[PDB]
Design a protein around this ligand. Structure first.
Ligand SMILES: *[C@H](C)[C@H]1/C(=C/c2[nH]c(/C=C3N=C(/C=C4\NC(=O)C(CC)=C4C)C(C)=C\3CCC(=O)O)c(CCC(=O)O)c2C)NC(=O)[C@@H]1C
Ligand SMILES: *[C@H](C)[C@H]1/C(=C/c2[nH]c(/C=C3N=C(/C=C4\NC(=O)C(CC)=C4C)C(C)=C\3CCC(=O)O)c(CCC(=O)O)c2C)NC(=O)[C@@H]1C
Ligand SMILES: *[C@H](C)[C@H]1/C(=C/c2[nH]c(/C=C3N=C(/C=C4\NC(=O)C(CC)=C4C)C(C)=C\3CCC(=O)O)c(CCC(=O)O)c2C)NC(=O)[C@@H]1C
Ligand SMILES: *[C@H](C)[C@H]1/C(=C/c2[nH]c(/C=C3N=C(/C=C4\NC(=O)C(CC)=C4C)C(C)=C\3CCC(=O)O)c(CCC(=O)O)c2C)NC(=O)[C@@H]1C
Ligand SMILES: *[C@H](C)[C@H]1/C(=C/c2[nH]c(/C=C3N=C(/C=C4\NC(=O)C(CC)=C4C)C(C)=C\3CCC(=O)O)c(CCC(=O)O)c2C)NC(=O)[C@@H]1C
Ligand SMILES: *[C@H](C)[C@H]1/C(=C/c2[nH]c(/C=C3N=C(/C=C4\NC(=O)C(CC)=C4C)C(C)=C\3CCC(=O)O)c(CCC(=O)O)c2C)NC(=O)[C@@H]1C
Lengths: 161, 160, 160, 161, 160, 161
């Protein structure tokens, strides 16, 4: 993984130059938004269980998905799916802190779509669940930090499609 | 950085950051400005620095540029100062990230291999960084100076 | 069943089935009928078993069906009774196969994470299965009761 | 790795159904065919070395395959080929006992066809040996159990094509 | 051969051939002709060697060739003597490469499993190779006999 | 892996023939050139670090490659390039002593042309550099063995061409 900081540094080293003013600006913008990210993380951490429960009951529990035969059917798969949502929330919370999505590409998305495909895990329903998480966390984190988390929750989402 | 590092610790134990790590992030992020000023002052005077530290490096290791030397001939001395300028840059990268990682992956991992095959004396590159340290902290005062200097040390120490 | 269990053993050792394993296949198979009788009678009175298990259960768990409870309301109490039918069906799959590999894979693995996120008191679901147990066994004669009852016992212990 | 009984159970669970009378009948017959299976597997086990031997003798020996240049040349490949025939025989009798081919698909055919194509192993000849094994075993196990072993030995060679 | 063996080790240690591995290669090649000669001496009396061994084998062990023994009949004794020809051919391969990897990969790995199901008594195959050994070393001078003999014994031990 | 000795043994084994008249000739002439290959394998070893250092100069130096953004930039990549140059030199030597390219096919070229393009290594450069190895090494050993080392070094280039 890589911070937005290291992200900026690398973008400059690839050009063999010291940090531009445009580079210092990216850096300044990341630093001043730190408190907001940490505070968001602290909340998303003390509420990770509730955020998942509510998003499940508000997206997935309004669909046929658990009727036997269902992809969400059997206690094993139910938990398997709840566990994925937890992963999304945690790693999206990993990414927001970092202001970079490299952790998602490296630890969450690599071969994720192919695995779901050969498993029959519906991508449509997972995407809908993630959006429910986007929404439920925004209500706890505020509109400002909510939008920032959305970026990362969306990223995972638009990576499986 | 101190953000990417603590995220790894957390990922490794499959949990959310600790209050201690979040707090450490707040302290780092808060002082981000100072780090930028420091790197800025250094960038702004890169040509003073690299040229000054270069003269001192020669007046101490006159052999390097003497005949059958690794940097003999304007062409060649030119490249030598370019390397001092490369390392002065990487140092500003550490200051801003407060992480040594970027200096390593760019100019430390594999250095001996490189200089060995080019026939360059690695211990000579080191003191050029020792000189660079002097011409740079020179423009810095106090804490701003101890900060930069610590990274210069790391580089100096990884090249000796 | 004992068939695939025996195969799994033999295959791991890269051998043919032992004489002990074949004997057990015979024993288990010869008794297959009796088992189908049991699944059969449980199934034919599934409605009465659950409905009756649900009553004694709410009679002892009036807090689960009273305001604030998890199974409060006709929509919730309905689903609750449907979980009871779920485990009853699972128990018949166990008796038939003489194996718990079916009950486990369908309704045990991840069962605690599942109910904790629905906010349902597992103890309560365990007591519910105790109600299904007597309600069902009661419908069976003799040793058929002690057979079907061992599986109910399995599910009970798994839910606590 | 599935059992016939388990196959029947999963078929109705995907439907959220209790075992129905025809389903029970499926199990009834599997049970009724129990001792005949746990017996053919008994004689097979005792004549496994002989079966593969008569199969190779009538199938491969003394031909292009064994002479220098064939895939059964060198003691190395000869043994490797006997080994494969011992494998099919064993795994086919396993399946029979199970009344389910899941085992073969998991432990036997997964990737076999490629693995052979990349080694120059003759698909049609190995299939010829499978014909021989089907024949020798049926002549020890009796007509009924012989066709019962032919379904699984067929499932294998046909899975090579 | 010795060459590929040294390549193998030096490659496992990411290094060039040691002075010791080079001396050996020098010496192994300088003795090339010696080896070729030995192979030709055997190869050219193929038949004489093989048929004699058969004669002796058969007298010492009139079993394999009596009714009921693996080589009874003319076809059958002929396939046996063909097998003794194979092994005599593999021997020249070893004495030629001063290495036993070829005898191994061609006639040793899997040989017990091959003959066992073929109903061939392998102690007897070793017997034949023993006669081969003497029939062949009989046509060689001293040193050359010590060499050829070593590869014969390797095959023997492996088949017994 | 395989040397010429085995190559010949095998070519005849596939036909069930004893050393063939032609095979003895092939074999014998491989023995005769044994000492030359050893002599050459010695000097190449004693001047390996030099061979590479000079080749890099007449080839990979003062080009765009080592500057920021090119593939040699960063003391990490620069080192990685020289490393690969040593493998070709050493493996070419291995291949030269053996009189067989199998070791290059098995330990050097396999899924290498891919890995390169994956990490965006500049194929045409690595080949112009290799070429320099042939000339530099040739001048030290001799066009006699340089002749043979050229044949093998060129063999690695083509495995990339
Ligand atoms: C009844 C004795 C208790 C009770 C039950 C209750 N359950 C739910 C919701 C669900 N239960 C399941 C259970 C399973 N799904 C499976 O695939 C299997 C394996 C066969 C089992 C056992 C599921 C998936 C749900 C989710 C909804 C759905 O049908 O998919 C509820 C609803 C909870 C809510 O609305 O929040 C209730 C009330 N509750 C009790 O208090 C009793 C002790
Ligand atoms: C939930 C919204 C949906 C759902 C999920 C579901 N997922 C699986 C199985 C797997 N999920 C993953 C994903 C991850 N593993 C990880 O370690 C991480 C961290 C980066 C992720 C994102 C993997 C690897 C698997 C396969 C391995 C396994 O089973 O654990 C299942 C199981 C499917 C099955 O048949 O067993 C399910 C059900 N299913 C849904 O219906 C929802 C829409
Ligand atoms: C025999 C009738 C024919 C024949 C066979 C032959 N097979 C191989 C090599 C392999 N066979 C397998 C298959 C399996 N391995 C397993 O563990 C299992 C499940 C228990 C199966 C089904 C594999 C994996 C290999 C390759 C690895 C290995 O050699 O063990 C060979 C070897 C070829 C070679 O060494 O180059 C041969 C000769 N060959 C014939 O000519 C017959 C028609
Ligand atoms: C002679 C000393 C003994 C003997 C031999 C005998 N062999 C066979 C049949 C076969 N022998 C082989 C041997 C090899 N195949 C190889 O690839 C190699 C390595 C180069 C060897 C040594 C093979 C493959 C066969 C099978 C038939 C064929 O050639 O395809 C027989 C015939 C067995 C039969 O009846 O089917 C016999 C008799 N028998 C003895 O009693 C001697 C001790
Ligand atoms: C100066 C203090 C000393 C000195 C320097 C010198 N360096 C070179 C050549 C090169 N130096 C590098 C260094 C780097 N490349 C990197 O990516 C990084 C990380 C930021 C570093 C530090 C490289 C790649 C070269 C190769 C040349 C090129 O750019 O292609 C030379 C030239 C050697 C030659 O003749 O080719 C010299 C002279 N030499 C001294 O004696 C001083 C002590
Ligand atoms: C030098 C002439 C050019 C150059 C080289 C370069 N190579 C790599 C990376 C790798 N090279 C290999 C190749 C091998 N590894 C082996 O073990 C063997 C023999 C068994 C070979 C042939 C591999 C595996 C890698 C990747 C793993 C690693 O980094 O070691 C790089 C690095 C690329 C990167 O971005 O990390 C480079 C730079 N590059 C050039 O520009 C020259 C023209």
């Amino acid at each position: 993984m890589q911070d937005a900081i290291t992200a900026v540094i690398n973008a400059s080293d690839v050009q063999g130059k010291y940090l531009d003013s445009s580079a210092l600006d990216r850096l300044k913008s990341y630093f001043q938004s730190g408190e907001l990210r940490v505070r968001a993380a602290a909340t998303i951490s003390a509420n990770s269980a509730l955020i998942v429960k509510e998003a499940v009951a508000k997206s997935l529990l309004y669909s046929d998905i658990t009727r036997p035969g269902g992809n969400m059917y059997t206690t094993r798969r139910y938990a398997a799916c709840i566990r994925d949502l937890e992963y999304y929330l945690r790693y999206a919370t990993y990414a927001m802190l970092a202001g970079d999505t490299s952790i998602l590409d490296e630890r969450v998305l690599n071969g994720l779509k192919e695995t779901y495909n050969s498993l029959g895990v519906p991508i449509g329903a997972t995407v809908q669940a993630i959006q429910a998480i986007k929404e439920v966390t925004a209500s706890l984190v505020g509109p400002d930090a909510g939008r920032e988390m959305g970026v990362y929750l969306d990223y995972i989402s638009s990576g499986l499609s | 950085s101190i953000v990417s590092k603590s995220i790894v610790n957390a990922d490794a134990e499959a949990r959310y950051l600790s209050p201690g790590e979040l707090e450490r992030i707040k302290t780092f992020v808060v002082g981000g400005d100072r780090r930028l000023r420091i790197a800025q002052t250094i960038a702004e005077s890169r040509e003073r620095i690299v040229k000054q530290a270069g003269n001192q490096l020669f007046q101490k290791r006159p052999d390097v540029v003497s005949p059958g030397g690794n940097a003999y001939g304007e062409d060649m001395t030119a490249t030598c100062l370019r390397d001092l300028d490369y390392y002065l840059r990487l140092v500003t990268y550490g200051v801003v990230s407060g992480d040594i990682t970027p200096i390593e992956e760019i100019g430390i991992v594999g250095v001996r291999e490189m200089y060995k095959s080019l026939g360059t004396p690695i211990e000579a590159v080191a003191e050029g960084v020792r000189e660079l340290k002097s011409a740079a902290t020179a423009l810095l005062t106090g804490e701003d100076a101890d900060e930069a200097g610590a990274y210069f040390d790391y580089v100096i120490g990884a090249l000796s």
